[PDB]
Structure formats: structure tokens, C-alpha cells
């Protein structure tokens, strides 16, 4: 275990004897993480990095039907809860009974707006975030029933209704603009084959304006580089085949700098704390940058590993992000939630599976039963689900209006 090596203690923060809110909060975190790392030593057992699959499964399978009122704050993110859960079950190789799947399909039908797109619950106005989640969920299920839920003509209209003259998209009518919208739109439009020639005109250029002095990408031009927004920006460009619109090298240096030398996990922004959900948003950028640089015929690219410490990330997730009761989380001390379960699992999968053309190479830390189903770095749903959905929707012509 890379994290448990003696020389690893040298990776502890060096505050230069100048404490500030930033160094103090970081130190508190490393302190808590170190206690977790050493728990084995102090208890005299052999470290067993085990992914609590059955614990995670009961939690997920149960959350898929009902949730406590603690979830009232997510009453407008119901298609997200479906996606997060269905995708977590998918990474854990757990199946979706044809009856559950049909129930999910019917629920999303209620969340779908007569104007295209999906709202965060039955009867809510449509928004791009739950539209992305609803579509990804229906693709994970992958039945004709599921695919048919989506009204493609109204979806294209909806996308057109959010499109801005500058290339950006609103998240919803009368709503805000940020890089998430470009990705939500490019993800649902591509999967469903509704991309018209002008739908994403200026979009690649707008996203390129979000890349700042740091190498990363901010929510809108001028903003601090952020891990969640950077994934959306790059993943959207990959879909649009315009990754070249970015300075891929400065982006590569920025994301690799986000992995925490001590904790092994990824931080969302420079000088902020480690967070398990960034195992996906940040580490997920490496496969995408691999694909892009390779498309440019980069000769120096690895043929077995992503450009981050796959081992250390798997260790942070396995040792520090699981809730014994099932479910995954931000960092030790945090409470579990379906969002973090989905992205901690999503990032683990990315950390375990490498691939580049004909090259395939796994790295599964701990017990071999830890290996998860692979995840598509652009859509974050199983690669099979991606091929299966796109091939299906390619049987339908792009809505002509």
C-alpha cells in the first residue's frame, strides 16, 4: 500500500510556518487521514482493502425505492437519484429486475416535459441537469421501453430553446449559464442522435473561453479552474470533436496537480480539500486527455496507465471513503449520500481500468472482488450502454422540424 509506506509521511503538508485558513484546514484533513492509514498498524491486523459490495448494494437497492425525508433537499433532483443509484448498481454488476426498470421508465415519463427535456420530479419544469440524468438512466436500463420514453423531437426543440447566441446554453428557461449545460446538452443530443448542423455552433469556442491561466476550466469565462466544470468542458469538447480548442497541455498539468500527494484523492480546486467525488470529475479527465493526445498521435503516451496515481486514488477511496453501513462519501467524517456513492465508485472504476486502442491494463488494489464494471469517461455510464444507445438512436433520423 503506497499510502502506508514510511516515506509517505514525507508527503505531509509543509506550511512554511505561515498558517492561514487554508493550511489549517488541510492539516486537519491530513491528520484525520493519517489516523485512518495507521488504523491497521495500531490494531495489529493485515490491511484488507475490501470494497463492501453487499453493504453498498442494500443501501442502493433500498434507496432506489424510497428515501427518508433527509432527501427533501433533493426533491428537484429525482432523475439524478435514479441515475446515481442505477449507475452505482451497474458498476457493482448488480442487475435491474425488468419490473424495477419498467417502474423507473414510467417515473421518468412523469418527469418528462411536454416541451421536451426532463424536470427534477413529476410536473416540474424541465432543466438540463435532470434531463442529462434522466437520459443517462434510461440508457443504463437500455430497453426499447426505456429508449422510447424520450421524445426526441421535443428534446431538440428544448435544446434549441436554451441555446445562446454566444454558443452557451441556459440550464433552463429563465435560468443560469455555466459549462455544465454544454455537457448536459452534448451528452443527451449525441446519445439520442438529434444533433443538427447548427445546434452546437459556437459551443466549442465558448467552452474554450472558460479555460483560464491555471490550465483548468471555470464555470463561465473569468472563473477559477474547477474540477466539476473542467470535466464538463472537456467531455463536451470530446463529444463535439473539438478537444483541440483547448490547451491540452496546460490542462494536463492542471488536473495532474489536483491529486493530493498525501491523501491520494483529488481536490476540486487548487488549495482546497480532498474529496472523493472528485475521483471521477478529476481522474475522469485523464482517460479523455489520453484519447485526445493520442488522436494527435502523441508518441510518449503510456500503454498501461492513466496519467495519475491509480494506486493512491484506489487506496484513498477504499480506506477513506466507505461508510461501514454501506454507501461512499466525501472524506472521513462526512455522511454517505447517493451522489458520492456514484462518483466514488465511478472514479474507482476509472482508476482500475486502463485502455488505449488495443492496450488494456487493470490495476485492482486489495481483494480482486474489488474490480468494478468499466465506465465510459465521457458519459459515465457503461461503455456497452453507450454503444447500445447510440446504435439504437442512429436508426432514427435527426429531427427535421
Amino acid at each position: 500500500l503506497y499510502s502506508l509506506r514510511p516515506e509517505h509521511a514525507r508527503e505531509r503538508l509543509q506550511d512554511d510556518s505561515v498558517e492561514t485558513v487554508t493550511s489549517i484546514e488541510q492539516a486537519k484533513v491530513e491528520e484525520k487521514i493519517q489516523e485512518v492509514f495507521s488504523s491497521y498498524k495500531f490494531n495489529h491486523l493485515v490491511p484488507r482493502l475490501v470494497l463492501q459490495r453487499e453493504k453498498h448494494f442494500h443501501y442502493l437497492k433500498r434507496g432506489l425505492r424510497q428515501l427518508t425525508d433527509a432527501y427533501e433537499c433533493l426533491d428537484a433532483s429525482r432523475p439524478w437519484l435514479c441515475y446515481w443509484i442505477l449507475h452505482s448498481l451497474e458498476l457493482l454488476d448488480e442487475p435491474i429486475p425488468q419490473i424495477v426498470a419498467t417502474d423507473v421508465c414510467q417515473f421518468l415519463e412523469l418527469c418528462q416535459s411536454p416541451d421536451g427535456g426532463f424536470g427534477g420530479g413529476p410536473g416540474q419544469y424541465p432543466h438540463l441537469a435532470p434531463t442529462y440524468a434522466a437520459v443517462n438512466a434510461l440508457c443504463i436500463i437500455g430497453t426499447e421501453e426505456a429508449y422510447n420514453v424520450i421524445n426526441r423531437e421535443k428534446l431538440l426543440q428544448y435544446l434549441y430553446s436554451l441555446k445562446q447566441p454566444d454558443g452557451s446554453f441556459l440550464m433552463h428557461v429563465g435560468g443560469e449559464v455555466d459549462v455544465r449545460s454544454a455537457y448536459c446538452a452534448a451528452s443527451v443530443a449525441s446519445l439520442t442522435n438529434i444533433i443538427t448542423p447548427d445546434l452546437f455552433e459556437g459551443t466549442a469556442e465558448w467552452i474554450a473561453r472558460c479555460q483560464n491561466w491555471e490550465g483548468g476550466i471555470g464555470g463561465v469565462p473569468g472563473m477559477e479552474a474547477h474540477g466539476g466544470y473542467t470535466f464538463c468542458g472537456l467531455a463536451a469538447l470530446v463529444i463535439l470533436k473539438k478537444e483541440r480548442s483547448l490547451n491540452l497541455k496546460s490542462l494536463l498539468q492542471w488536473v495532474t496537480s489536483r491529486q493530493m500527494r498525501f491523501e491520494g484523492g483529488f481536490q476540486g480546486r487548487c488549495n482546497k480539500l480532498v474529496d472523493g467525488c472528485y475521483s471521477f470529475w478529476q481522474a475522469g479527465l485523464l482517460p479523455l486527455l489520453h484519447r485526445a493526445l493520442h488522436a494527435q498521435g502523441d508518441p510518449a503516451l503510456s500503454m498501461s496507465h492513466w496519467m495519475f496515481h491509480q494506486q493512491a486514488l484506489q487506496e484513498y477511496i477504499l480506506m477513506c471513503c466507505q461508510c461501514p453501513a454501506g454507501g461512499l462519501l466525501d472524506k472521513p467524517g462526512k455522511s454517505r449520500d447517493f451522489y458520492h456513492t456514484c462518483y466514488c465508485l465511478s472514479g474507482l472504476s476509472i482508476a482500475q481500468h486502463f485502455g488505449s486502442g488495443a492496450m488494456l491494463h487493470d490495476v485492482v488494489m486489495g481483494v480482486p472482488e474489488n474490480v468494478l464494471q468499466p465506465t465510459h469517461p465521457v458519459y459515465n455510464i457503461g461503455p456497452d450502454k453507450v454503444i447500445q444507445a447510440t446504435t439504437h438512436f442512429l436508426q432514427k433520423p435527426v429531427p427535421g422540424f
Binding site: 508527503e11 503538508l13 509543509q14 512554511d16 492561514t20 485558513v21 487554508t22 493550511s23 434507496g63 425505492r65 424510497q66 428515501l67 425525508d69 432527501y71 427533501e72 433533493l74 426533491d75 428537484a76 429525482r78 437519484l81 417502474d103 414510467q106 417515473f107 412523469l110 424536470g119 427534477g120 420530479g121 413529476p122 410536473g123 416540474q124 419544469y125 429563465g174 435560468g175 443560469e176 483560464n212 491561466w213 490550465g215 464555470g219 463561465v220 473569468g222 472563473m223 477559477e224 474547477h226 496546460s250 498539468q253 495532474t256 496537480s257 493530493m260 500527494r261 480546486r269 487548487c270 488549495n271 482546497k272 508518441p299 510518449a300 503516451l301 503510456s302 492513466w306 495519475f308 496515481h309
Partner: protein, 315 residues
Amino acid sequence: GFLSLDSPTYVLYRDRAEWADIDPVPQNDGPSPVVQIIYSEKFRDVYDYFRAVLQRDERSERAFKLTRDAIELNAANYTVWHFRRVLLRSLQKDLQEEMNYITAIIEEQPKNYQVWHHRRVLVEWLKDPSQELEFIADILNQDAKNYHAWQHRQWVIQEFRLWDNELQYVDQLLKEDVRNNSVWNQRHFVISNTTGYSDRAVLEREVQYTLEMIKLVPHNESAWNYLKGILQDRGLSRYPNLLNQLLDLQPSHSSPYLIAFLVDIYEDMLENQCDNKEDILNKALELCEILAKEKDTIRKEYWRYIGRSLQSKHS
């Protein structure tokens, strides 16, 4: 008549006489619900009634007061927020009182997206940015890194052209936490939108300032990223003195940022037809191995890629 959702004497809407005329509309989750939330009685009561007034599109003062409750129950419900803005214009509500309201709820939920977007809509409507910089500074006093607060601050500044005192605000916050990357970002936002970095005196002032910050806190990555970000533009090799000046901190202020920075200056020298290419290449390749094997192993795959890439190019 605002009966606080938290008032000890708060009464369910179904028990309120001034609402007895309207029938609450329950949520349609289907016969076989998935991800079904077991709502509290209060939540369920307010939303079933919100559904009622929304379905009938009742633009009343009572409906207006109710959206306030639905928002407090779930501030992320954007559908409620929409209807609330619909009622703000229909009923011709005082938008300044609404600014008071949005100020309160943002203080409570500063990381909520809806609350900030709403405040922006109000500022647009009123074409009044007079309270903004001060309000945002109060939020940043509680969390100097709040992303929405910084985003709103950038919008107000660019939109209403309030650039004059921002660099000063930046210096203040940098004093409080020189490691606050949001502030290093704001510094760049102000400068590039005002003087630019082409002005040699500005560039000189910025590089010098940054270098003094690196001297004080050598392991602070933000100052390192900023130094790189503002020079990387024209090319690091374009600044011959810089390699020397950092090569001098090699013993005193020698973090893995300085090492990485040297490999960065080398990469650009090699690309820009530098003297001693065989020599420079070796140093840069040496540093990549030291970094990969010893100094910055978490990034070993990256630094190796760099080494390989540097060879394939400048062999």
C-alpha cells in the same frame, strides 16, 4: 402576514381558513414509485398546496407568500423559484424588499445556485448594483472561497464596470490567506480586464510581487501557478533572468514547485531553439526523474510522460 415556517405557532396550510377554498394537489409518483421521498407532514402540506396554486396559475399574494415557504423547504426547487419571479412581476412587488429577502436566504444557503441566480435577476431588474460588492464581501468573509459569490462578484464588476477598488480588495484577501486560490484568480481577472499583462511595468510588478510571496510561503502552490500562468503566455524562455533567479532559491526555497517550474522553463527553451540543447535537455530529464522517483511521485506517470515526450522531441 408572514407566519414563519419555523414559528412555534406555524399551522399547516390545510388547517388554515384563508386557504380552505382551494384543494391541495398531491404529487403523481405513479402506482409504483422509485426514489420516493418520505416527506415530512410540513413539506408535503406546502408542496401539495404549491401544486394547487401553480396548476391553476393563481397569481395571488397568498400564493406569493406560500412560495416563500416552499423555497425554505427546498431552496433548490427551481420550479418554485420561477413561479415566484412570475408573481414578483404580476403583483408588482417591491423589488427592494425582495432584495432584503434574497440577502437573508443567501446568508443561510450560500452554496445554493437558485438563490444567487435570483439575486442577479433582481439586480438586473432594478439596474442597481450599489449593494453588491458589500453584500458579496460579507459572504466571502464567511467563506472566502465560495464559488457562486466569486462568480456573482465577477458578473457585477464586469456588467456595471466596477473595477476601481477590486485589486485593493484582492490585496486585502491575499493578506488574510495568501493561499486562497480564488483570490489569485480574482487578481488575474481584474488585471487582464483593466491594464492587461502586456504593460511591462504591470508584468514586472506582478512577477516581483509573486516572487516575494513564493519567498514567504515556498510551498504555496497558488503563487507558483500564478507566476507560471502570467509568463507562460509569451513563453517562459522569453525571460532569461527568471531561470537564474529561481535556480538561486534551489537551496533556500526549494519545493517540488520550483523543480517543476525549472522543467517548465526548460521545455520552452528546447521548443524555442535555445543554446546548449543537449545540455538543457539532460537537466530537464534529470529533474523529471527526480520528480517521478523522489520529489513528486504522486505524479510519476505525468513526469515520466514529460521525460519521454521531451526525448521524443529534442533527442
